[PDB]
Design a protein around this motif. Structure first.
Motif, mmCIF file in Angstrom:
data_model
loop_
_atom_site.group_PDB
_atom_site.id
_atom_site.type_symbol
_atom_site.label_atom_id
_atom_site.label_comp_id
_atom_site.label_asym_id
_atom_site.label_seq_id
_atom_site.Cartn_x
_atom_site.Cartn_y
_atom_site.Cartn_z
ATOM 1 N N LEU A 1 64.796 -85.427 -92.180
ATOM 2 C CA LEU A 1 64.397 -86.173 -93.367
ATOM 3 C C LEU A 1 63.422 -85.384 -94.228
ATOM 4 C CD1 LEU A 1 64.015 -89.744 -91.869
ATOM 5 C CD2 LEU A 1 66.067 -88.672 -92.819
ATOM 6 N N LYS A 2 62.566 -84.556 -93.630
ATOM 7 C CA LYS A 2 61.575 -83.821 -94.410
ATOM 8 C C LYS A 2 62.207 -82.744 -95.287
ATOM 9 C CE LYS A 2 59.542 -82.205 -90.679
ATOM 10 N NZ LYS A 2 58.503 -81.549 -89.827
ATOM 11 N N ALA A 3 63.464 -82.389 -95.041
ATOM 12 C CA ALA A 3 64.193 -81.474 -95.904
ATOM 13 C C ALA A 3 64.772 -82.165 -97.131
ATOM 14 C CB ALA A 3 65.311 -80.795 -95.113
ATOM 15 N N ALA A 4 64.571 -83.471 -97.284
ATOM 16 C CA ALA A 4 65.198 -84.226 -98.354
ATOM 17 C C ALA A 4 64.213 -85.203 -98.979
ATOM 18 C CB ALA A 4 66.398 -85.017 -97.821
ATOM 19 N N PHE A 5 64.577 -85.665 -100.163
ATOM 20 C CA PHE A 5 64.027 -86.875 -100.755
ATOM 21 C C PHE A 5 65.002 -87.989 -100.403
ATOM 22 C CE2 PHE A 5 63.865 -89.922 -104.231
ATOM 23 C CZ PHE A 5 62.517 -90.107 -104.423
ATOM 24 N N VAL A 6 64.518 -89.018 -99.706
ATOM 25 C CA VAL A 6 65.394 -90.014 -99.095
ATOM 26 C C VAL A 6 65.118 -91.383 -99.701
ATOM 27 C CG1 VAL A 6 66.297 -90.968 -96.953
ATOM 28 C CG2 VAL A 6 65.356 -88.652 -96.985
ATOM 29 N N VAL A 7 66.165 -92.016 -100.219
ATOM 30 C CA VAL A 7 66.097 -93.350 -100.799
ATOM 31 C C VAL A 7 66.644 -94.358 -99.804
ATOM 32 C CG1 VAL A 7 66.779 -94.845 -102.681
ATOM 33 C CG2 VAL A 7 66.440 -92.406 -103.120
ATOM 34 N N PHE A 8 65.819 -95.331 -99.461
ATOM 35 C CA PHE A 8 66.213 -96.471 -98.638
ATOM 36 C C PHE A 8 66.442 -97.621 -99.611
ATOM 37 C CE2 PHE A 8 65.373 -94.774 -94.385
ATOM 38 C CZ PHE A 8 64.647 -93.648 -94.696
ATOM 39 N N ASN A 9 67.705 -97.850 -99.956
ATOM 40 C CA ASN A 9 68.067 -98.834 -100.965
ATOM 41 C C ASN A 9 68.359 -100.160 -100.273
ATOM 42 O OD1 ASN A 9 69.142 -100.349 -103.057
ATOM 43 N ND2 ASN A 9 71.161 -99.400 -102.841
ATOM 44 N N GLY A 10 67.446 -101.113 -100.443
ATOM 45 C CA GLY A 10 67.532 -102.420 -99.822
ATOM 46 C C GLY A 10 68.137 -103.499 -100.693
ATOM 47 N N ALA A 11 69.045 -103.106 -101.576
ATOM 48 C CA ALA A 11 69.860 -104.057 -102.306
ATOM 49 C C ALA A 11 70.700 -104.892 -101.336
ATOM 50 C CB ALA A 11 70.762 -103.301 -103.276
ATOM 51 N N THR A 12 71.367 -105.907 -101.894
ATOM 52 C CA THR A 12 72.140 -106.840 -101.077
ATOM 53 C C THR A 12 73.075 -106.113 -100.121
ATOM 54 O OG1 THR A 12 72.022 -108.497 -102.833
ATOM 55 C CG2 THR A 12 73.739 -108.772 -101.149
ATOM 56 N N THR A 13 73.743 -105.064 -100.600
ATOM 57 C CA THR A 13 74.439 -104.135 -99.718
ATOM 58 C C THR A 13 73.608 -102.862 -99.641
ATOM 59 O OG1 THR A 13 76.590 -105.054 -100.287
ATOM 60 C CG2 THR A 13 76.563 -102.852 -99.366
ATOM 61 N N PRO A 14 72.873 -102.622 -98.561
ATOM 62 C CA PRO A 14 72.005 -101.445 -98.536
ATOM 63 C C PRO A 14 72.794 -100.145 -98.531
ATOM 64 C CG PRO A 14 71.208 -103.089 -96.989
ATOM 65 C CD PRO A 14 72.562 -103.553 -97.459
ATOM 66 N N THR A 15 72.164 -99.099 -99.072
ATOM 67 C CA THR A 15 72.691 -97.742 -99.009
ATOM 68 C C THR A 15 71.529 -96.785 -98.782
ATOM 69 O OG1 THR A 15 72.532 -97.339 -101.401
ATOM 70 C CG2 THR A 15 74.617 -98.295 -100.559
ATOM 71 N N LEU A 16 71.853 -95.546 -98.400
ATOM 72 C CA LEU A 16 70.880 -94.465 -98.321
ATOM 73 C C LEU A 16 71.222 -93.418 -99.364
ATOM 74 C CD1 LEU A 16 70.616 -93.864 -94.480
ATOM 75 C CD2 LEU A 16 68.668 -94.351 -95.954
ATOM 76 N N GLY A 17 70.195 -92.808 -99.925
ATOM 77 C CA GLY A 17 70.358 -91.684 -100.830
ATOM 78 C C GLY A 17 69.614 -90.464 -100.322
ATOM 79 N N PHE A 18 70.216 -89.293 -100.502
ATOM 80 C CA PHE A 18 69.586 -88.029 -100.158
ATOM 81 C C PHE A 18 69.674 -87.072 -101.330
ATOM 82 C CE2 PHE A 18 69.057 -88.261 -95.488
ATOM 83 C CZ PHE A 18 69.876 -89.324 -95.179
ATOM 84 N N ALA A 19 68.549 -86.422 -101.636
ATOM 85 C CA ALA A 19 68.510 -85.316 -102.579
ATOM 86 C C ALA A 19 67.776 -84.142 -101.949
ATOM 87 C CB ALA A 19 67.796 -85.692 -103.884
ATOM 88 N N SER A 20 68.148 -82.939 -102.366
ATOM 89 C CA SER A 20 67.340 -81.769 -102.073
ATOM 90 C C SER A 20 66.047 -81.821 -102.884
ATOM 91 C CB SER A 20 68.122 -80.511 -102.407
ATOM 92 O OG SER A 20 69.241 -80.370 -101.550
#
Ligand SMILES: COC(=O)[C@@H](N)Cc1ccc(F)cc1
Ligand SMILES: COC(=O)[C@@H](N)Cc1ccc(F)cc1
Length: 330
Positions: free
Chosen positions: A310-329
């Motif tokens: 995880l420390k190699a990325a910017f990580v989005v924990f999207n807690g919308a009604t249907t959750p998703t994860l996002g990763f960026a460099s």
């Protein structure tokens, strides 16, 4: 609303990260380990068995004018390393980085296992997995994020962990200056109560990318990257002298080695973990055998994208009604 708090490694290896949290009125600031792999907010407290406290800052509910005993409620949790804690429950005001939740369940430890006592830098955990994993009985309680969600500008939090340096947890917004390129989002399964997703494959160093589905969890509370034995063997085969040591408990390598990078897939995107992130230093003081940051998950039952990944990325924990994860460099 939003919040933004700096998270700081507890030691020189990035064993874990602590984030200051204000609890009660007047505020009592405790340094908590934000855990996306668990769902209890628990603290060392004035109720913790005295012999089990060794340097931690404690929460004293009797000194908080907003604390209220949650009558009849108890909690008890066991983690992946075998550590554990348990106690009773208060509700109180909890703030992180300027974001305030009233009526948050603050789980006060009466007992903690030795690994907690022995770490003086961690004053408790703040769980950020799904509230279905919360251990409070007989009335399960919500996480800080679940309680804050409706008030947030956007129902998200982000983890931006540093390598041998501080980083940031943000709540309610995505800091578009904190990453490079674009964020690639990927599906999450909430069925088991974790931020469970499927990586699209991996590469070792400059080698070719292997397309293969790897189901695992995004766990800020886990230090290392735990992957299937096939993947881990392929990685360590590129390090001369590396081997799995049953006595040490995982792959070790000569401290004189230069480690290759490890890439993992997020959809069509790729996150590169630099080799240096995989070095966890001598197995014991003065040893020339070093502990690896990529280890087999075979004995766990799930793959864990812990801090190494995880420390190699910017990580989005999207807690919308249907959750998703996002990763960026970054
Ligand atoms: C596994 O325990 C923990 O996560 C906390 N005691 C933090 C911690 C993790 C690893 C380590 F080498 C030292 C400290
Ligand atoms: C495998 O689970 C973990 O290690 C973390 N998700 C939880 C955890 C965090 C800190 C600690 F001191 C002990 C355990």
């Amino acid at each position: 609303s939003t919040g933004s708090a700096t998270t700081t490694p507890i030691d020189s290896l990035d064993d874990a990260y602590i984030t200051p949290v204000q609890i009660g009125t007047p505020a009592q600031t405790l340094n908590l380990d934000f855990d996306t792999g668990s769902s209890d907010l628990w603290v060392f407290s004035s109720e913790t068995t005295a012999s089990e406290v060794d340097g931690q800052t404690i929460y004293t509910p009797s000194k908080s004018t907003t604390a209220k005993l949650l009558s009849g409620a108890t909690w008890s949790i066991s983690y992946g390393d075998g550590s554990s804690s348990s106690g009773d429950v208060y509700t109180d005001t909890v703030s992180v980085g300027g974001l305030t939740v009233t009526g948050q369940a603050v789980e006060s430890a009466k007992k903690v296992s030795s690994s907690f006592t022995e770490d003086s830098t961690i004053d408790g955990l703040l769980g950020l997995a799904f509230s279905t994993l919360n251990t409070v009985s007989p009335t399960q309680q919500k996480t800080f994020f679940d309680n804050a969600k409706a008030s947030l500008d956007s129902p998200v939090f982000t983890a931006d962990l540093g390598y041998h340096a501080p980083g940031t947890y943000n709540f309610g917004f995505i800091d578009t200056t904190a990453y490079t390129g674009s964020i690639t989002y990927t599906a999450v399964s909430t069925k088991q109560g974790f931020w469970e997703w499927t990586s699209t494959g991996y590469a070792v160093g400059s080698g070719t990318f292997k397309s293969t589905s790897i189901d695992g969890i995004a766990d800020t509370g886990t230090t290392l990257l735990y992957l299937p034995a096939t993947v881990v063997s392929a990685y360590w085969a590129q390090v001369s002298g590396a081997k799995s040591s049953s006595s040490v408990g995982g792959y070790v390598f000569p401290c004189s080695a230069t480690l290759p990078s490890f890439t993992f897939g997020v959809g069509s995107a790729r996150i590169v973990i630099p080799g240096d992130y995989i070095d966890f230093g001598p197995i014991s003081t003065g040893s020339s055998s070093c502990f690896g940051g990529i280890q087999s998950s075979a004995g766990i039952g799930i793959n864990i994208f812990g801090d190494v990944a995880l420390k190699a990325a910017f990580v989005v924990f999207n807690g919308a009604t249907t959750p998703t994860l996002g990763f960026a460099s970054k």
